[PDB]
Design a protein around this ligand. Structure first.
Ligand SMILES: [Ca+2]
Ligand SMILES: [Ca+2]
Ligand SMILES: [Fe+3]
Ligand SMILES: [Fe+3]
Ligand SMILES: [Fe+3]
Ligand SMILES: [Fe+3]
Lengths: 212, 191, 212, 191, 212, 191
């Protein structure tokens, strides 16, 4: 059983001429040794980073003079700021657990390839926001399962509790909110032959300005 | 089904930016984003348990967020001028940064100084493109880039250059203790 | 892979004459598709609803002029109010996750059938309260296991964390408190041939008035 | 083993409610509980992601809690009069409500108005039973039901009727936007 | 199915002459009946108790007149006080769940035997602190796994959430902090032939006084 | 590799404790720790669901923490006098306490009184060893043990003796109710 104390005893001996101390790091519970939890967490920071900029572009698009939807723009700006903040938080968690961030790490979770386009009408934009938030949420479920269930030799409840507290609880609220927005728009489009659509989009945008 | 409203058109004579200037601004936006990503990697490096320089980590994570704000300010300027009604998706691309490790605080500060120096030169080139277009001298944007962006660049370069000089003087004989103390000073902690 | 965005692209086409958008809802992690977690959560709201009214009747019984135990009545009124509040909270969680509440949903957990009677002497009433709280607690353990362990294709840590935070932590405190009350009454009944029983019940009720 | 105290008896002449009145009160208690359960189902319906009317959901969850309070007030009245020393377990039965879905806010408001109208009629029948018993006119309970319960009923009916009229006028041409705005007004939000 | 209510009905019968009430306790979810979670929790209180006194001796050693490292002493005193407080908290949790504390209970987790010595130079002391905190953290991972994964008939998310909230989250921070301290000392020892070591230890101790 | 600094030596004439006194102090430190562990076991016993005396549990957990503080004060005294530059690891040994169950509050209070009585006698023996060493009368330590430690001991014994007398009088006919009320009084609760 290698320990940091034993590494010190060995290397601090007059016989030694170095001080490697490989066990004197923050790694415990074999974090990073078994399973894919460590690399998946790095890829999760990368997903938040990419989405933060996708949301930023949507916020910009809704703030052009033709669309001019301050409420939709505010909704996306908030999603962007939150994803940017989470990117940094995950990077710090990766290093807190004794690993190092690799910005080119890929996830093993088989996820289809669909480019994010910022130029969308209101319903399309909310639908894409809903899909991307569900993807972030299901990725957290995947990492959580990898940490506490998929590998016989890996059990990391620290990562599980971190995901539960910092990601999982709030994902349900965001997804429910976005799903509700798509239902509202769907009704504006279909009821009474969609006759109130333009006034409804204006009223809905004003509502977002007050509630986002 | 009709899910969107038939677009309307309003007067457009007020939309005056020219192509060369607009393209230089779009390129600058990508450059600011690239800088934010490179600073994130520096923050990540100094956050490692085996490096453990929280002062440097915070300095660079703060710099990453500031570069993201610079990108947002340039985007807001284009929107104010009536641009970005299309071609928004192609404005940015997130890619892994080129460098992910530094030997110590001095190497990172010198790399940051060089990155800032490159950004300053690039902004001066946007200014040239926007001012010297034979068909339209964009007085207002040139003024904005000069008074806001260059102001931040020159102050930032001097700050990084001073930090690099101060810390580098400690490297020939006090690499560990010198960097340790300097790092805590970045956090406002006088040991 | 069906997504809300793809549903919008299809239905918002000039070819379409409807806007179903089946994937534009708050369902993710296949909530409700595999396993019994979704139906068990609905049955859990139903159990709290039924118990809230059982506790309310016990609170009423202890407030009749013959029993007149304000402390016991307050204990049951608090249990009733908490169970009523949890009923609404669970219903809201069921809908937050994209499902709909069904008030006739039954649990699969094999639980014996024992009618709740409100007319009881003090020890009997506390014993029944203890048993019903243990049943609520074990039902939470069951749903938690169904969400994260029993079904190979179902892993829902959002439901697990919700149960951990809103139910599981507090159940241990309530059960320990009620178990302690039964121990106190047991001693009043058995020590010194139970001679101090009537005075002890009075003193104990006064104690409940100050501590519930 | 003797786990309980041998009961004692005190004077009972003060306990005066008569059977017909007491039975009508017991039936009213079950009716209030039934109403609380039906309102819970309305709250659940408007909470669904595909319905998404949080204003209506809150309105009905609040109504459910209020009906539960009405049941508790009637139970407290019986206890004050010296009743419920037995026959407490049979006072209530929780069962799934009859309806679980509504086409829109108007249908739910009209259903609520009809439920309240039924409760008002039932309370008036409890009053009749309690006042007209040839052996005992229960002046105090009749007064309590009239001044407290009926007061709440009539104000509540007028409130629901007005809400239904206002929203229903918007249904022939503004079903979606009309209900959306009305729903936010229930939350105190002026869009 | 034995219940506390049924025990009361039986024992409170004129036929009975006792009041055992074996089911009227705080035990639920078969806590203590299957698996090793109950005994492991008791052994965990014992580990914290032993470590609290080991840390106390290190705090004393660094406060002797020759070492005189107030920062190192403060670091160990804090670790000691926290471990003492956790010892009492775990004992209370053991009893809250209806069990009783046994101070001679051993853990099944195969852990090597290494005496804790308080007389150490700075790097050695931090290395040992790091190793002992990793051991406390991995023991929590072990109990957590025993409660929710290792035994088919045992699922106790109350113990899992208790460990997640009260131990697991904070262990990561402490271990990362201690690992960072060993990295700093390693550099003071190796850079520039270790020439600044004595001044660096003084400066580092002053830093600990301000940040512990 | 050289991981530590070559030790330095300063004047040592100020370090004056003699062996017999120092050894008695070391033994007292282990005794205080042993008392803290025995009190922890009492706290654990009264915390059990089937015992349920939270007042007694808190009383004994508080006593356990106080004994730990006594051990720390003795250790700090030795450090102040220049001792414990070595032989620190052997100062203490944590072992399971001898007793883990008590019939009731009276037995626990009487056991605590006896433990305190033993500690008082042991401190008086440390005082004798420190004062009567023919080569060095340690005036200051004797004074410290007498004015601080014995002061706490005598007040503590009187407190426990009074509690035991008061509760024991209730045991012949009011074992359950008497202990229940006494227990809540320990929590500052007058039923
Ligand atoms: Ca879990
Ligand atoms: Ca959790
Ligand atoms: Fe910039
Ligand atoms: Fe939490
Ligand atoms: Fe009512
Ligand atoms: Fe003591």
């Amino acid at each position: 059983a290698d320990t940091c104390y034993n590494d010190v005893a060995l290397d601090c001996g007059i016989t030694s001429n170095s001080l490697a101390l490989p066990r004197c790091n923050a790694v415990y519970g074999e974090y990073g040794s078994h399973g894919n939890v460590a690399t998946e967490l790095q890829a999760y920071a990368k997903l938040h980073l990419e989405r933060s900029y996708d949301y930023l572009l949507s916020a910009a698009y809704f703030n052009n003079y033709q669309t001019n939807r301050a409420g939709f723009s505010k909704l996306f700006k908030k999603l962007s700021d939150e994803a940017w903040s989470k990117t940094i938080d995950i990077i710090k968690h990766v290093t807190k657990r004794g690993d190092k961030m690799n910005f080119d790490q890929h996830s093993t979770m088989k996820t289809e390839r669909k480019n994010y386009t910022a130029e969308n009408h209101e319903l399309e934009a909310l639908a894409k926001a809903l899909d991307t938030q569900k993807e972030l949420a299901e990725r957290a479920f995947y990492i959580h399962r990898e940490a506490t269930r998929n590998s016989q030799h890996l059990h990391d409840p620290e990562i599980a509790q971190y995901l539960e507290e910092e990601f999982i609880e709030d994902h349900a609220e965001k997804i429910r909110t976005l799903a509700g927005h798509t239902s509202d728009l769907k009704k504006f489009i279909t009821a009474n032959n969609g006759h109130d659509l333009s006034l409804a989009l204006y009223v809905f945008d004003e509502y977002l300005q007050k509630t986002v | 089904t009709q899910c969107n409203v038939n677009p309307v058109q309003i007067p457009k004579d007020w939309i005056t930016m020219h192509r060369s200037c607009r393209n230089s601004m779009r390129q600058q936006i990508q450059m600011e984003v690239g800088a934010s990503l490179q600073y994130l990697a520096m923050g990540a490096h100094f956050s490692k348990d085996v490096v453990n320089r929280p002062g440097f980590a915070q300095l660079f994570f703060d710099a990453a967020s500031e570069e993201r704000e610079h990108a947002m300010k340039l985007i807001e300027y284009l929107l104010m001028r009536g641009e970005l009604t299309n071609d928004v998706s192609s404005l940015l691309q997130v890619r892994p940064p080129t460098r992910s490790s530094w030997k110590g605080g001095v190497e990172a500060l010198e790399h940051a100084l060089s990155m800032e120096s490159d950004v300053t030169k690039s902004i001066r080139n946007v200014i040239k493109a926007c001012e010297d277009d034979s068909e339209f001298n964009d007085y207002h944007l040139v003024d904005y880039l000069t008074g806001d962006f260059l102001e931040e660049q020159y102050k930032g370069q001097r700050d990084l250059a001073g930090k690099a000089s101060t810390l580098k003087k400690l490297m020939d004989r006090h690499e560990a203790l010198g960097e340790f103390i300097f790092d805590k000073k970045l956090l406002g902690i006088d040991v």
